[PDB]
């Protein structure tokens, strides 16, 4: 096209953890993503 060379990065991917303090205490569930940023959630 114009030969403006380009870089490739494996697009943000990662595991998910869950923040939950026990069914007895409550049921609110929060989510954690590790190998990514909030910009591309």
């Amino acid at each position: 096209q114009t030969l403006e060379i380009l870089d490739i990065t494996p697009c943000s991917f990662g595991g998910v953890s869950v923040i939950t303090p026990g069914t007895n205490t409550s049921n609110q569930v929060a989510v954690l993503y590790q190998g990514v940023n909030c910009t591309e959630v």
Binding site: T9, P10, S12, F13, G14, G15, Q34, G35
Partner: peptide
């Protein structure tokens, strides 16, 4: 840290719970 030298297609390093700062 400087003595030693410096997202891999399905295999990842996880962060430590204990960052170098907290360490």
């Amino acid at each position: 840290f400087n003595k030693v030298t410096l997202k891999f297609k399905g295999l990842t390093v996880l962060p430590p719970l204990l960052t170098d700062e907290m360490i």
